Design a binder for this molecule. Structure first.
Ligand SMILES: *[C@@H]1O[C@H](CO[C@@H]2O[C@@H](C)[C@@H](O)[C@@H](O)[C@@H]2O)[C@@H](O[C@@H]2O[C@H](CO)[C@@H](O)[C@H](O)[C@H]2NC(C)=O)[C@H](O)[C@H]1NC(C)=O
Ligand SMILES: *[C@@H]1O[C@H](CO)[C@@H](O[C@@H]2O[C@H](CO)[C@@H](O)[C@H](O)[C@H]2NC(C)=O)[C@H](O)[C@H]1NC(C)=O
Ligand code: FT8
Ligand SMILES: *[C@@H]1O[C@H](CO[C@@H]2O[C@@H](C)[C@@H](O)[C@@H](O)[C@@H]2O)[C@@H](O)[C@H](O)[C@H]1NC(C)=O
Ligand code: CL
Ligand code: ZN
Length: 608
């Protein structure tokens, strides 16, 4: 480690620790930037060499965290928890958490390299036929979204899960062991316990379970209503009205949101098509237009536009030069207060417009807290970060707003168009809730040892059936590693943040709509051009992680905890309607035939 990055001598008291923190975060900006820069070069251009360079940067980051962590324990380990400055206590507590810098050098290299190889496998895996080959994005994504051929959907689902998951499993086992070894030396029972510590809530898991209990009836009724529609399309042979739904039939490779089968379950197909994708294509929208439209929503709230460095440096379309890239959408802070970027293989669809807003919400956060010391350049918690752009997307998706931006002819404020809209939104938001909850239940069990390699897939499908009420459409065994076929697992991105975000965003929406002076139904609110709403949001974003998220949340919504009531209030009308439809059709809520799996299509896979 270069001498200019190594820690100096400071007095072992709070005054000295304030200077210590200043010195730490001036040198951390330089180290963070070289790490982020090298990850960018790899993720937009996957090669062996860019992997080598990203690993050299990670090693340097670990030398740096080691030097400053040790010094902080040396100087302040007995005293810092009694510092009177609460922001300083946060910074010091973070610095003395070394994570993978606790590993000896050779295990640092093995850990850094497992990450590179798992990333490569996920983002370069292909599904080949009997002879070109399909990538996840756009090819398999488009098939899962738009094909209504059971056998084609099956070939894509099985092909993807086999191609990504199987080769990842031995690597994922090795990564898990090294991660745990590292964080045990910070005092955590396992890596999962460290991830959970970010929410600074002793009742976190209980609080999440309580939340899910209030939401599950909504999901169960949505599930039964959709299962009935799939039964009509595919037949009693492939759909069991009292069993789990085959996992390839819900419009999405992971069955995690169902908006792509809206056209199949829309009760009132005579009414205007609330999926404006066709109009977007008709009108010639491109990725740049989508990002500019999102930007203008932010500036309408008097938040910040995207800076020149964003437009010059971001990757907004999949490269056509054949380069391999990580296509999964992501947002990047280079910790130099100047460079901020999105990397997204943008497609022209309505759901991609929502994802553009999701990613730009991250950038806005970065811009609002870029002048905090680096340790506070974080969401109040990770769920806050994932929620920001989704909140704006809630306003954008209203038929009123879509009409304002030229994507929909005005609809009638009647009950039936209301039901169409809330149902489309339920397919996007309610259907996700079980998946957002279960992914880290699986991963926490892996980190804790409750789920050894011998049960990776057994416990994954236990949770997928328990929570989502789906089943694999072909037999699986422990050679398969179906959790590995979901980006965040090999790319080691925690997931409970998305469950938190999907609850939180309705708490935020309700607060911002009240602040805008809106007084109609919550699900028709559009906060566009509300400078009052923008001001309330700006307060959150500029706080970073300098204050406890419970306090930041109370300032914003009036309450110091996650709360399902705003989401329930948003969906109330369709919650009731779905309950009624299910009763009239005599549905069974849930999936009591929990063992059921569909048969294979005749002659599969030969007829394609
Ligand atoms: C749309 O109409 C609502 C009124 O609800 C209607 O009632 C049903 C019987 C059926 O007609 C639904 O399709 C309708 O939505 C308006 O909401 C009211 O706004 C006032 C304003 O002061 C407010 O005080 C009331 O509480 C609101 N009532 C309800 C039931 O929420 C709403 O503003 C209209 N919005 C648009 C965009 O047309
Ligand atoms: C993708 O990354 C590779 C490095 O792995 C880049 O290849 C280098 O390209 C520069 C061009 O300025 C040459 O000077 C080097 O000799 C190349 N090195 C190797 C090993 O090929 C490549 O340019 C990158 N591609 C893009 C589109 O940025
Ligand atoms: O979050 C992300 N990207 C989005 C894009 C699609 S929308 C969104 C909401 C639903 C849940 C989740 C889903 O798709 O699985 N999700 C995403 O992953 C990125 S910022 C996460 C990331 C962080 C660091 C490095 C790399 C990636
Ligand atoms: C695991 O599964 C592998 C492939 O799946 C198999 O093929 C389908 C068509 C069905 O026959 C299904 O029952 C099978 O699982 C097998 O190659 C492998 O032997 C299976 N067992 C193990 C231990 O890997
Ligand atoms: Cl998280
Ligand atoms: Zn995100």
């Amino acid at each position: 480690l270069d001498p200019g990055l190594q820690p100096g001598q400071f007095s072992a008291d709070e005054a000295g620790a304030q200077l210590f923190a200043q010195s730490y975060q001036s040198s951390a900006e330089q180290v963070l930037f070289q790490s982020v820069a090298a990850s960018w070069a790899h993720d937009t251009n996957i090669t062996a060499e860019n992997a080598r360079r990203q690993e050299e940067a990670a090693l340097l980051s670990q030398e740096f965290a080691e030097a400053w962590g040790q010094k902080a324990k040396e100087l302040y380990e007995p005293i810092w928890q009694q510092f009177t400055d609460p922001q300083l206590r946060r910074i010091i507590g973070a610095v003395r958490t070394l994570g993978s810098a606790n590993l000896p050098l050779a295990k640092r290299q093995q850990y850094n390299a497992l990450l590179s190889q798992m990333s490569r496998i996920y983002s370069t895996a292909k599904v080949c036929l009997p002879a070109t080959c399909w990538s996840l994005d756009p090819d398999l994504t488009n098939i899962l979204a738009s094909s209504r051929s059971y056998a084609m959907l099956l070939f894509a689902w099985e092909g993807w899960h086999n191609a990504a998951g199987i080769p990842l499993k031995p690597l994922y086992e090795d990564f898990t062991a090294l991660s745990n070894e590292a964080y045990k030396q910070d005092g955590f029972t396992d890596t999962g316990a460290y991830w959970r510590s970010w929410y600074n809530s002793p009742t976190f898991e209980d609080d999440l379970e309580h939340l899910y209990q209030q939401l599950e009836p909504l999901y169960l009724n949505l599930h039964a209503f959709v299962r009935r529609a799939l039964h009509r399309r595919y037949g009693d042979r492939y759909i069991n009205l009292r069993g789990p739904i085959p996992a390839h039939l819900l419009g999405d490779m992971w069955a995690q949101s169902w908006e792509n089968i809206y056209d199949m379950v829309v009760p009132f197909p005579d009414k205007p098509n609330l999926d404006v994708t066709s109009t977007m294509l008709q009108q010639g929208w491109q990725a740049t237009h989508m990002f500019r439209v999102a930007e203008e929503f932010f500036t309408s709230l008097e938040l910040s536009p995207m800076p020149p460095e964003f437009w010059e440096g971001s990757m907004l379309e999949k490269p056509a030069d054949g380069r391999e890239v990580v296509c999964h959408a992501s947002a990047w802070d280079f910790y130099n207060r100047k460079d901020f970027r999105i990397k997204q293989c943008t497609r022209v669809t309505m759901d991609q417009l929502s994802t553009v807003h999701h990613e730009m919400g991250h950038i806005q956060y970065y811009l609002q807290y870029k002048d905090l010391p680096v340790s506070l350049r974080r969401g109040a918690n990770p769920g806050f970060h994932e929620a920001i752009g989704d909140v704006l997307a809630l306003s954008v998706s209203t038929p009123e707003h879509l009409h304002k931006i030229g994507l929909l002819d005005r609809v009638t404020n009647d009950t039936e168009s209301d039901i169409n809209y809330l149902l489309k939104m339920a397919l996007e938001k309610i259907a996700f809730l079980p998946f957002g909850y279960l992914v880290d239940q699986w991963r926490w069990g892996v980190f804790s040892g409750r789920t050894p390699p011998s049960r990776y897939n057994f416990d994954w499908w236990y949770l997928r059936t328990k929570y989502q009420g789906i089943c694999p459409p072909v037999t699986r065994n422990e050679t398969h590693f179906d959790a590995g076929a979901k980006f965040h697992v090999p790319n080691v991105t925690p997931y409970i943040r998305y469950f938190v975000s999907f609850v939180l965003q309705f708490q935020f929406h309700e607060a911002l709509c009240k602040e805008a002076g809106y007084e109609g139904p919550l699900h028709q609110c559009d906060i566009y051009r509300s400078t009052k709403a923008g001001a309330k949001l700006r307060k959150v974003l500029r706080a970073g992680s300098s204050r406890p998220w419970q306090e930041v949340l109370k300032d914003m919504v009036g309450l110091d905890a996650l709360d399902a009531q705003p989401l329930l209030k948003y969906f109330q009308l369709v919650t009731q309607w779905l309950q009624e439809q299910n009763q009239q059709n005599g549905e069974v809520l849930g999936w009591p035939e929990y063992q059921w799996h569909p048969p294979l299509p005749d002659n599969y896979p030969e007829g394609i």
